[PDB]
């Protein structure tokens, strides 16, 4: 009768917007046409992570297991452990906590043990400097993802430590109209339980493809020895384009698998980064939901951010429809005057939210 | 146009974008690896992108209110 | 005798320094087709039998038969330095060999004779070659102590690996293309994972030098000879020496298994070859 939703599409965003806005939510028909219908194990463990990180939020599930009614409590945050199930790595759990985090009572010092990263989901270094600098631009100061034990795709056993300790009152409003002049193209390549020459065969191919450019290329290498190597061999590569003059970033990452040649994987992440940096304006396409949720929980004023005509696709449409059903904020889409690059300026008036859990 | 195209309830998102012209999977979209590698064998299309305190605070908030009104 | 070939169950072969490509059978043991080629070191059959490909320490590569007259084809200066080992593919039409002029070259059987198609340069004197029994990948052993694995549809340098601290001199590949076995002259074989190249057990036996390791091609278990007259066979799940065999007297140069049930024949420096079979 109050807030109804269909399907497990953008489900993490539905639950994180319910607990930020403080409105009760109800989502039914979580893949109801299926032989194994209802809530999967990773999202049930995600909901009990939410219950561990909040207080007073009650969660009830139907006997079908496809209907979830959620009252929200207050975001206490704090320090706790959380084993994550092997169906889904730590990125899928940490990336909604990364914008639920900075408003709580205590500091966020929460450690995730399990699979580090996989293909469809976010890597740890990927979120580290593809999403902590955009958080630093939106207003937080002290945030870190202490990677203190890497894991692996099929067995995992890795340990990350999300710690944010800048309890901001509210995110400051954002003003980005210029396409950022990309100064540096950096990246890292990580390897676990393999030969170290796999890293060089990644990096020489990737910077061979990107070496025809005037930009300063700098990719670093890390192997993980000892018990920081996880429990299965695996290796990945991530690259960011860092614009230092205002501090923006774009990024692309991938992890190899059985038969993945390091040269062609470096070529694939290099071309994927060029796809993202040609397709995206002023913010990463994967950085976009965090960007619009901080702009919509900004101060009671308008904040404006440039995106291009490529950025508007079905994920962005279901994002804006989600926020328009949760706290009914129309996003105004101005066009930029120079039509050589068909860019929209999204202006969003932030709902006047403050964090209401601070001992003062 | 595109604002009422988004906020109209009836149409699907892909029908909206094809009239104009699943997010648990975090990863951004991508084309064929060989296709965009062959397209970007030369990458000079992206060369256009590549290359006192109280009166300070009052000026900050008043310029915020002024740009708020000027796009209102 | 430097090398052994063996067919399914019937005919067997010995390769020596004079060129005595002796054609044997396990039931009457008379050398059927004795002839003379030269300083030969490694060899292989053709999969229906009756046709024998064989290299030499000279610059040559020769092919012989069973029924008709002995010499059919030879390619002199196929590699202008010594060659070490050769392999048919999983089917028996290509012919890869490696040679200490830092070259590995392919050949194609055409009709009676051979035909060179593709050379490949390496940064070291290559001295061993092994191709998977499903043509998934080939592996080469280089005295700058490394093992390189290439594919076969592309030969696109899949995995460079190292870690033996002496020239590795024998490679084998698992029967179902999941695990390779590298073996050097520091008495330490290494069972190696395949998807990325993780070592599993860098285990140690045959207290002077491993001379040849070979794979029991039914399960994933394997025989390893020595240079000190001992041949063991190991299992590839618990990595313990499930059998030692002490019954030679000198440097066991070569061995070869037979694909019917893992029916193995070994050959040493003391001119003796012998047959090991089931209990």
XYZ file of C-alpha atoms in Angstrom:
711
model
C 0.000 0.000 0.000
C 3.030 2.256 0.485
C 5.956 1.440 -1.840
C 5.752 -1.564 -4.145
C 8.355 -2.906 -6.553
C 8.670 -5.672 -9.116
C 11.630 -7.938 -9.770
C 15.238 -8.135 -8.604
C 16.376 -5.425 -10.998
C 18.452 -2.677 -9.329
C 17.589 -4.441 -6.075
C 20.598 -3.183 -4.115
C 19.690 0.349 -5.156
C 16.087 -0.159 -4.035
C 17.112 -1.348 -0.579
C 19.860 1.256 -0.109
C 17.492 4.048 -1.141
C 14.842 2.706 1.219
C 17.248 2.815 4.141
C 18.671 6.218 3.195
C 15.284 7.860 2.703
C 13.740 6.163 5.711
C 10.664 5.015 3.781
C 9.407 1.430 4.073
C 9.698 -0.640 0.924
C 8.177 -3.854 -0.410
C 9.539 -5.805 -3.380
C 7.716 -8.821 -4.779
C 8.100 -11.297 -7.652
C 11.854 -11.758 -7.326
C 12.192 -13.972 -10.459
C 8.849 -15.624 -9.732
C 8.871 -17.410 -13.083
C 11.757 -19.714 -12.227
C 12.499 -23.258 -11.093
C 14.415 -21.759 -8.137
C 12.273 -18.671 -7.506
C 12.763 -16.014 -4.892
C 15.705 -14.432 -3.130
C 19.135 -15.871 -3.856
C 21.703 -16.592 -1.158
C 23.910 -13.595 -1.940
C 21.061 -11.133 -1.614
C 19.743 -12.753 1.582
C 23.240 -12.467 3.063
C 23.283 -8.898 1.742
C 20.050 -8.155 3.597
C 21.467 -9.532 6.808
C 24.553 -7.380 6.233
C 22.143 -4.429 6.095
C 20.579 -5.677 9.325
C 24.008 -5.914 10.946
C 24.961 -2.401 9.819
C 21.670 -0.737 10.761
C 19.511 -0.908 13.853
C 15.766 -1.339 14.150
C 15.313 -2.248 10.484
C 13.066 -5.312 10.404
C 13.034 -7.640 7.384
C 10.336 -10.212 6.662
C 10.348 -12.719 3.801
C 7.393 -14.686 2.450
C 7.214 -18.475 2.458
C 7.599 -18.253 -1.309
C 10.756 -16.268 -0.601
C 10.043 -13.866 -3.465
C 8.442 -11.045 -1.441
C 10.450 -8.842 0.922
C 8.909 -6.207 3.196
C 11.445 -3.830 4.719
C 10.991 -1.270 7.336
C 14.061 0.936 7.742
C 15.742 1.704 11.037
C 18.684 4.043 11.563
C 22.155 3.561 10.122
C 24.329 2.810 13.143
C 27.248 1.444 11.148
C 30.156 0.436 13.310
C 32.737 -2.336 13.277
C 31.822 -5.921 12.459
C 32.908 -8.915 10.444
C 31.021 -10.410 7.532
C 31.754 -13.612 5.673
C 30.416 -13.299 2.210
C 29.075 -16.358 0.374
C 31.015 -17.762 -2.558
C 28.183 -17.164 -5.035
C 29.247 -13.511 -5.340
C 32.464 -11.613 -4.471
C 33.083 -8.798 -1.989
C 32.479 -6.045 -4.546
C 28.736 -6.677 -4.765
C 28.511 -6.276 -1.010
C 30.848 -3.330 -0.596
C 29.617 -1.048 -3.425
C 26.266 -0.209 -1.728
C 28.008 0.238 1.628
C 30.289 2.730 -0.092
C 27.431 5.246 -0.216
C 25.506 3.987 2.761
C 28.638 4.400 4.870
C 29.585 8.005 5.756
C 26.409 8.998 7.629
C 26.310 6.474 10.470
C 26.938 6.700 14.216
C 30.408 5.208 14.485
C 33.164 4.739 11.957
C 32.886 2.065 9.293
C 35.569 -0.534 10.001
C 34.080 -3.647 8.428
C 36.093 -6.549 7.026
C 34.912 -8.825 4.224
C 36.273 -12.353 3.856
C 35.595 -14.329 0.706
C 36.051 -14.137 -3.048
C 37.848 -10.918 -3.967
C 36.486 -10.207 -7.439
C 35.034 -11.766 -10.571
C 33.999 -10.784 -14.082
C 30.501 -9.320 -13.831
C 31.134 -7.468 -10.566
C 33.505 -4.843 -9.165
C 37.144 -5.348 -8.281
C 38.660 -4.031 -5.094
C 41.281 -1.786 -6.696
C 38.574 -0.892 -9.204
C 36.358 0.504 -6.470
C 39.412 1.924 -4.637
C 40.548 4.425 -7.192
C 37.559 4.491 -9.413
C 35.137 5.361 -6.625
C 37.033 6.702 -3.646
C 38.250 9.808 -5.585
C 34.682 10.520 -6.663
C 33.719 10.252 -2.996
C 36.541 12.674 -2.172
C 35.088 15.028 -4.754
C 31.579 14.686 -3.332
C 32.815 15.563 0.116
C 34.231 12.802 2.298
C 37.838 13.053 3.441
C 39.024 9.796 5.049
C 37.987 6.639 3.205
C 39.981 3.510 2.472
C 39.676 -0.072 1.289
C 42.541 -1.801 3.100
C 43.230 -4.859 0.959
C 44.968 -7.003 3.549
C 44.544 -10.410 1.887
C 43.636 -11.002 -1.739
C 41.418 -13.842 -2.806
C 40.661 -15.726 -5.984
C 37.756 -16.481 -8.341
C 37.007 -20.149 -7.468
C 38.026 -20.463 -3.786
C 38.592 -16.924 -2.528
C 39.654 -16.703 1.097
C 40.603 -13.047 0.732
C 40.241 -10.203 3.192
C 39.367 -6.588 2.533
C 38.752 -3.950 5.185
C 36.403 -1.131 4.251
C 37.126 1.690 6.669
C 35.633 5.140 6.303
C 36.129 7.568 9.151
C 34.793 10.853 7.787
C 31.267 11.073 9.190
C 30.147 13.834 6.859
C 26.993 15.782 7.654
C 25.773 15.615 4.042
C 27.547 15.424 0.676
C 28.429 18.803 -0.757
C 26.789 19.756 -4.005
C 28.569 19.141 -7.285
C 29.451 21.468 -10.157
C 31.016 19.800 -13.195
C 30.389 21.322 -16.633
C 33.793 20.854 -18.247
C 35.019 17.657 -19.819
C 38.074 16.819 -17.688
C 41.506 17.148 -19.274
C 42.993 13.698 -18.700
C 46.487 14.140 -17.294
C 47.688 10.669 -16.355
C 46.811 7.099 -17.310
C 47.810 4.810 -14.449
C 46.866 1.351 -13.314
C 47.843 -1.734 -11.377
C 48.190 -5.403 -12.255
C 47.720 -7.935 -9.478
C 48.710 -11.596 -9.475
C 47.983 -14.408 -7.005
C 49.682 -17.841 -6.928
C 51.135 -17.594 -10.460
C 54.448 -16.824 -12.090
C 55.422 -13.129 -11.962
C 56.119 -12.941 -15.721
C 52.347 -13.034 -16.348
C 52.279 -9.467 -15.036
C 54.923 -8.265 -17.501
C 53.142 -10.040 -20.351
C 50.027 -8.100 -19.337
C 51.681 -4.714 -18.980
C 53.863 -4.701 -22.078
C 50.882 -5.577 -24.265
C 48.555 -3.043 -22.643
C 51.036 -0.170 -22.724
C 52.044 -1.309 -26.221
C 48.496 -0.624 -27.369
C 48.309 2.630 -25.389
C 51.889 3.731 -26.126
C 50.998 5.698 -29.283
C 49.722 8.614 -27.180
C 51.194 11.746 -25.607
C 49.635 10.964 -22.207
C 51.839 9.803 -19.333
C 51.279 6.054 -18.938
C 52.206 4.428 -15.630
C 51.122 0.915 -14.719
C 52.443 -0.793 -11.604
C 52.848 -4.440 -10.692
C 52.081 -6.443 -7.586
C 52.336 -10.114 -6.898
C 51.013 -11.465 -3.629
C 53.301 -13.899 -1.829
C 52.693 -15.969 1.275
C 49.218 -16.321 2.741
C 48.197 -12.995 1.192
C 47.890 -14.929 -2.087
C 44.450 -16.334 -1.485
C 43.808 -20.020 -2.026
C 43.684 -20.297 -5.837
C 45.688 -18.770 -8.695
C 44.229 -15.763 -10.427
C 45.354 -12.438 -11.821
C 43.724 -9.221 -12.924
C 44.456 -5.829 -14.408
C 42.888 -2.427 -13.854
C 43.584 0.962 -15.387
C 42.373 4.407 -14.398
C 42.630 7.677 -16.251
C 43.265 10.216 -13.504
C 42.727 13.928 -14.108
C 44.643 15.632 -11.312
C 43.676 19.270 -11.992
C 40.276 18.629 -10.415
C 40.589 14.968 -9.406
C 38.320 12.913 -11.651
C 38.816 9.342 -12.792
C 37.665 6.772 -15.306
C 38.566 3.113 -15.102
C 38.317 -0.372 -16.551
C 39.279 -3.759 -15.144
C 39.227 -7.471 -15.875
C 40.438 -10.740 -14.368
C 41.865 -13.549 -16.458
C 40.694 -17.149 -16.404
C 41.591 -20.565 -17.841
C 43.443 -19.868 -21.072
C 43.463 -16.073 -20.814
C 46.595 -14.787 -22.525
C 47.989 -11.781 -20.591
C 48.759 -9.840 -23.789
C 45.202 -10.007 -25.099
C 43.769 -9.342 -21.637
C 45.851 -6.168 -21.423
C 44.606 -5.258 -24.890
C 41.018 -5.917 -23.795
C 41.214 -3.712 -20.718
C 43.002 -0.985 -22.709
C 40.316 -0.957 -25.383
C 37.591 -1.139 -22.718
C 39.078 1.928 -21.017
C 39.113 3.731 -24.354
C 35.453 2.754 -24.824
C 34.609 4.186 -21.420
C 36.637 7.380 -21.872
C 35.150 8.029 -25.298
C 31.617 7.122 -24.253
C 31.566 8.936 -20.913
C 31.494 12.619 -19.973
C 32.818 14.070 -16.678
C 32.082 10.866 -14.704
C 32.510 7.157 -15.305
C 29.555 5.210 -16.659
C 30.106 2.717 -13.852
C 30.639 5.626 -11.434
C 27.265 7.065 -12.485
C 24.857 5.589 -9.838
C 27.082 6.742 -6.966
C 27.347 10.151 -8.622
C 23.627 10.675 -8.975
C 22.841 9.330 -5.520
C 25.275 11.768 -3.910
C 23.875 14.570 -6.047
C 20.353 13.637 -4.985
C 21.265 13.463 -1.276
C 23.111 16.752 -1.587
C 21.996 19.958 0.091
C 18.634 21.624 -0.706
C 19.908 23.291 -3.888
C 20.667 22.285 -7.454
C 23.847 20.542 -8.489
C 24.874 20.138 -12.082
C 26.946 17.421 -13.736
C 27.819 16.857 -17.387
C 27.004 13.583 -19.131
C 26.864 12.855 -22.834
C 24.145 11.446 -25.069
C 25.728 8.002 -24.741
C 25.270 7.915 -20.941
C 21.479 7.766 -21.234
C 20.599 4.084 -21.539
C 18.464 1.538 -19.730
C 20.485 1.386 -16.507
C 20.262 5.175 -16.223
C 16.532 5.051 -17.000
C 15.836 2.472 -14.306
C 18.002 4.510 -11.887
C 16.032 7.695 -12.446
C 12.713 5.855 -12.258
C 13.862 4.239 -8.999
C 14.732 7.577 -7.417
C 11.473 9.062 -8.748
C 9.512 6.335 -7.036
C 11.536 6.519 -3.810
C 11.790 10.249 -3.161
C 10.175 11.729 -6.299
C 12.887 14.028 -7.632
C 12.744 15.033 -11.277
C 16.188 15.375 -12.852
C 16.364 18.372 -15.168
C 18.264 17.703 -18.400
C 19.651 20.853 -19.946
C 21.569 20.709 -23.228
C 24.992 22.281 -23.460
C 25.130 25.083 -26.034
C 27.944 23.762 -28.242
C 26.305 20.974 -30.262
C 29.594 19.511 -31.500
C 29.298 17.230 -28.448
C 25.654 16.514 -27.586
C 26.025 16.734 -23.827
C 23.319 16.984 -21.218
C 23.813 18.843 -17.969
C 21.881 17.005 -15.291
C 20.747 19.415 -12.598
C 19.384 17.728 -9.485
C 17.983 19.522 -6.466
C 19.121 17.501 -3.492
C 16.654 16.466 -0.826
C 17.589 18.320 2.343
C 18.972 15.325 4.202
C 21.381 15.412 7.116
C 22.786 12.460 9.005
C 20.655 12.074 12.102
C 22.772 9.675 14.124
C 25.665 11.797 15.403
C 26.483 12.229 19.085
C 26.870 15.989 19.359
C 11.867 15.931 -24.583
C 14.033 13.349 -22.837
C 12.837 14.365 -19.364
C 9.211 13.506 -20.027
C 10.475 10.514 -22.033
C 12.197 9.193 -18.899
C 9.479 10.048 -16.409
C 6.602 8.718 -18.507
C 5.557 5.550 -16.705
C 4.256 3.417 -19.559
C 7.166 2.733 -21.895
C 10.063 0.368 -21.334
C 13.590 1.836 -21.074
C 14.982 0.284 -24.261
C 11.877 1.353 -26.176
C 12.457 4.808 -24.693
C 16.021 4.966 -25.968
C 15.042 3.632 -29.399
C 12.251 6.215 -29.524
C 14.782 8.884 -28.559
C 17.570 7.867 -30.936
C 19.494 -5.493 -14.477
C 21.992 -3.463 -12.464
C 23.133 -6.210 -10.092
C 25.560 -6.875 -12.902
C 27.732 -3.895 -12.055
C 29.976 -3.916 -15.127
C 29.475 -1.277 -17.842
C 28.466 -2.392 -21.288
C 30.876 -3.395 -24.030
C 31.083 -4.351 -27.683
C 33.140 -6.981 -29.506
C 36.780 -6.860 -28.351
C 38.162 -7.322 -31.868
C 35.768 -4.689 -33.229
C 36.769 -1.861 -30.942
C 40.446 -2.871 -31.011
C 40.338 -2.623 -34.805
C 38.446 0.683 -34.580
C 41.003 2.069 -32.106
C 44.130 0.841 -33.827
C 44.508 4.625 -34.125
C 43.218 6.640 -31.174
C 43.531 10.278 -32.198
C 39.755 10.770 -32.002
C 40.197 11.185 -28.225
C 42.955 13.793 -28.723
C 40.255 16.464 -28.336
C 39.921 15.317 -24.720
C 43.545 14.432 -24.046
C 46.478 16.797 -23.559
C 39.016 36.986 4.708
C 37.407 33.687 5.629
C 33.923 34.890 6.531
C 33.503 36.868 3.324
C 34.878 33.810 1.518
C 32.178 31.609 3.065
C 29.477 34.197 2.394
C 30.630 34.517 -1.217
C 30.509 30.724 -1.497
C 26.936 30.333 -0.259
C 25.681 33.434 -2.078
C 27.185 32.282 -5.377
C 25.522 28.924 -4.726
C 22.156 30.637 -4.242
C 22.758 32.798 -7.314
C 23.498 29.872 -9.617
C 20.520 28.083 -8.040
C 18.277 30.986 -9.031
C 19.914 31.427 -12.434
C 19.094 27.855 -13.409
C 15.725 28.059 -11.675
C 69.889 -47.528 -27.335
C 68.881 -43.872 -27.286
C 65.140 -44.064 -27.817
C 62.111 -46.346 -27.871
C 58.917 -46.209 -29.879
C 56.027 -48.607 -29.375
C 52.751 -49.263 -31.202
C 49.442 -50.371 -29.642
C 50.532 -53.849 -28.554
C 52.433 -55.544 -31.392
C 55.582 -53.815 -32.647
C 58.310 -51.995 -30.766
C 61.424 -50.114 -31.682
C 64.966 -49.384 -30.567
C 67.033 -46.408 -31.744
C 70.804 -46.343 -31.338
C 74.014 -44.522 -32.343
C 74.802 -46.666 -35.392
C 71.351 -46.321 -36.889
C 70.013 -49.723 -35.868
C 66.307 -48.892 -35.981
C 65.500 -52.316 -34.664
C 61.888 -53.390 -35.170
C 60.754 -55.772 -32.446
C 57.765 -57.697 -31.191
C 57.107 -58.798 -27.614
C 56.369 -62.391 -28.620
C 59.379 -63.525 -30.690
C 61.852 -60.672 -29.945
C 63.819 -60.948 -33.188
C 64.728 -57.607 -34.712
C 62.583 -57.588 -37.830
C 63.883 -54.785 -40.048
C 67.437 -53.890 -39.099
C 68.996 -51.118 -41.150
C 71.562 -48.368 -40.777
C 71.015 -44.620 -40.630
C 73.577 -42.955 -38.409
C 73.830 -41.158 -35.091
C 70.136 -41.256 -34.296
C 68.792 -40.151 -30.940
C 64.989 -39.731 -31.049
C 62.138 -41.151 -33.060
C 58.406 -41.817 -33.292
C 55.986 -44.037 -35.163
C 53.220 -43.216 -37.576
C 49.962 -44.182 -35.901
C 48.980 -47.140 -38.043
C 52.405 -48.653 -37.582
C 54.752 -49.643 -40.412
C 56.287 -46.151 -40.804
C 58.967 -44.601 -38.584
C 60.075 -40.974 -38.369
C 63.494 -40.391 -36.805
C 66.005 -37.600 -36.233
C 69.759 -37.417 -35.749
C 72.544 -35.347 -34.224
C 73.627 -34.488 -37.740
C 71.635 -31.908 -39.648
C 69.196 -34.447 -41.036
C 65.743 -35.922 -40.517
C 64.857 -39.321 -41.943
C 61.822 -41.535 -42.483
C 61.717 -45.327 -42.854
C 59.154 -48.126 -43.001
C 58.533 -51.784 -42.228
C 57.457 -53.691 -45.342
C 59.271 -52.280 -48.382
C 62.853 -51.036 -48.797
C 64.174 -49.159 -45.806
C 65.011 -45.572 -46.764
C 62.146 -43.610 -48.329
C 62.719 -39.941 -47.542
C 65.395 -37.878 -45.857
C 65.812 -34.135 -45.487
C 69.434 -33.136 -45.028
C 70.153 -29.684 -43.564
C 66.605 -29.571 -42.240
C 68.274 -27.888 -39.257
C 71.875 -26.823 -39.728
C 72.766 -27.807 -36.146
C 71.819 -30.894 -34.148
C 68.184 -31.716 -33.529
C 66.993 -33.238 -30.285
C 63.419 -34.517 -30.374
C 60.357 -34.676 -32.594
C 56.647 -35.394 -32.367
C 53.659 -36.215 -34.443
C 50.499 -34.375 -33.485
C 47.450 -36.067 -31.948
C 46.359 -37.293 -35.410
C 49.593 -38.024 -37.275
C 49.898 -35.548 -40.124
C 52.053 -32.709 -38.820
C 55.594 -33.195 -37.578
C 57.133 -30.784 -35.114
C 60.785 -30.904 -34.172
C 63.150 -28.732 -32.174
C 66.819 -28.168 -32.746
C 69.821 -26.490 -31.143
C 70.171 -23.874 -33.867
C 67.432 -22.191 -31.756
C 64.767 -23.344 -34.208
C 61.557 -25.327 -33.962
C 60.088 -26.284 -37.322
C 56.981 -28.036 -38.595
C 56.550 -30.558 -41.383
C 53.566 -32.045 -43.169
C 53.235 -35.570 -44.499
C 52.321 -35.429 -48.197
C 51.967 -37.847 -51.091
C 55.324 -40.509 -49.232
C 57.424 -37.459 -48.418
C 57.497 -34.483 -46.065
C 57.040 -30.756 -46.595
C 58.347 -27.925 -44.441
C 55.834 -25.159 -43.773
C 56.736 -23.035 -40.741
C 59.841 -22.164 -38.743
C 59.844 -20.561 -35.296
C 62.803 -18.821 -33.695
C 63.495 -18.984 -29.972
C 65.970 -17.097 -27.811
C 67.756 -20.281 -26.703
C 68.923 -23.696 -27.858
C 65.674 -25.656 -27.634
C 66.187 -29.262 -26.582
C 62.800 -30.854 -25.936
C 59.332 -30.820 -27.532
C 56.031 -32.384 -26.454
C 52.611 -31.926 -28.078
C 49.350 -32.680 -26.242
C 47.401 -35.838 -27.191
C 44.416 -33.684 -28.245
C 46.433 -30.966 -30.085
C 45.452 -28.419 -27.450
C 48.978 -27.062 -26.890
C 52.641 -27.845 -27.418
C 55.451 -27.332 -24.930
C 59.147 -26.784 -25.541
C 62.069 -27.091 -23.136
C 64.943 -24.621 -23.437
C 68.342 -24.780 -21.732
C 68.021 -21.239 -20.550
C 66.048 -23.134 -18.054
C 62.492 -22.556 -19.168
C 59.370 -24.246 -20.498
C 57.286 -22.434 -23.106
C 53.781 -23.573 -24.024
C 52.286 -22.482 -27.347
C 48.885 -23.253 -28.831
C 48.451 -25.170 -32.097
C 45.835 -23.223 -34.030
C 47.835 -20.022 -33.588
C 51.113 -20.699 -31.711
C 50.549 -17.509 -29.743
C 52.907 -18.028 -26.743
C 50.472 -19.166 -24.076
C 52.735 -19.672 -21.064
C 56.397 -18.987 -20.338
C 57.482 -20.661 -17.117
C 60.675 -21.380 -15.222
C 62.087 -22.555 -11.919
C 64.274 -25.622 -12.401
C 67.837 -24.182 -11.991
C 69.165 -26.490 -14.731
C 68.091 -27.294 -18.314
C 64.839 -29.193 -18.138
C 65.178 -32.124 -20.507
C 61.845 -33.949 -20.538
C 58.235 -32.770 -20.840
C 54.975 -34.656 -20.782
C 51.356 -33.527 -20.993
C 48.332 -35.100 -19.284
C 46.103 -37.503 -21.184
C 43.011 -35.299 -20.872
C 44.858 -31.963 -21.220
C 44.855 -30.730 -17.637
C 48.381 -30.986 -16.179
C 51.939 -31.024 -17.515
C 55.041 -32.669 -16.073
C 58.401 -30.983 -16.445
C 61.615 -32.700 -15.466
C 65.177 -31.413 -15.222
C 68.650 -32.651 -14.356
C 68.472 -31.506 -10.728
C 66.582 -34.667 -9.634
C 63.343 -32.697 -9.148
C 60.322 -33.150 -11.355
C 57.478 -30.647 -11.207
C 53.829 -31.421 -11.730
C 52.410 -28.200 -13.138
C 48.881 -26.880 -13.263
C 47.687 -25.740 -16.623
C 45.159 -22.877 -16.566
C 47.710 -20.347 -15.318
C 50.838 -22.388 -14.653
C 50.787 -22.918 -10.911
C 53.247 -25.511 -9.685
C 51.769 -28.163 -7.427
C 54.540 -30.530 -6.284
C 58.186 -29.823 -7.059
C 59.080 -33.301 -5.925
C 62.439 -34.977 -5.818
C 63.816 -38.439 -6.604
C 66.324 -40.278 -8.844
C 69.333 -38.991 -6.986
C 71.609 -38.148 -9.921
C 69.438 -36.828 -12.810
C 66.052 -37.362 -14.410
C 66.621 -38.494 -17.981
C 63.051 -39.026 -19.205
C 59.567 -38.798 -17.727
C 56.521 -40.255 -19.459
C 52.808 -40.453 -18.808
C 50.630 -43.490 -18.213
C 47.959 -42.280 -20.648
C 44.877 -43.939 -19.098
C 44.659 -42.300 -15.676
C 46.813 -39.352 -14.640
C 49.744 -41.318 -13.263
C 53.243 -41.376 -14.650
C 56.571 -43.181 -14.948
C 59.902 -41.451 -14.423
C 63.272 -42.963 -15.237
C 66.616 -41.993 -13.763
C 70.230 -41.829 -14.726
C 71.039 -44.225 -11.860
C 69.219 -47.370 -13.003
C 65.945 -46.775 -11.161
C 62.530 -46.235 -12.737
C 59.644 -45.243 -10.501
C 56.040 -44.534 -11.125
C 53.982 -42.009 -9.241
C 50.319 -41.152 -8.869
C 49.111 -37.667 -9.659
C 46.719 -37.116 -6.772
C 48.768 -37.876 -3.654
C 52.221 -37.594 -5.297
C 53.828 -40.515 -3.469
C 56.175 -43.054 -5.026
C 53.715 -45.877 -5.420
C 56.389 -48.047 -6.987
C 60.162 -48.121 -7.262
C 61.859 -50.429 -9.754
C 65.586 -51.037 -9.422
C 66.154 -53.600 -12.152
C 68.624 -51.918 -14.491
C 72.373 -51.540 -14.087
C 73.306 -48.227 -15.713
C 71.958 -44.972 -17.145
C 68.335 -45.552 -18.145
C 68.294 -43.333 -21.208
C 64.741 -43.765 -22.382
C 61.353 -45.329 -21.814
C 57.968 -45.423 -23.494
C 54.522 -46.501 -22.380
C 52.005 -48.420 -24.471
C 48.508 -47.009 -24.795
C 46.526 -50.227 -24.326
C 46.788 -50.281 -20.530
C 49.948 -48.413 -19.711
C 52.245 -51.235 -20.833
C 55.739 -49.858 -20.539
C 59.169 -50.615 -22.024
C 62.408 -49.125 -20.695
C 65.897 -48.952 -22.172
C 69.246 -48.288 -20.565
C 72.939 -47.729 -21.252
C 73.849 -51.392 -20.677
C 72.275 -52.303 -24.077
C 69.305 -53.868 -22.248
C 65.726 -52.941 -22.858
C 62.983 -54.696 -20.949
C 59.226 -54.890 -20.576
C 57.119 -54.008 -17.555
C 53.491 -55.101 -17.464
C 50.718 -55.595 -14.933
C 50.710 -57.902 -11.927
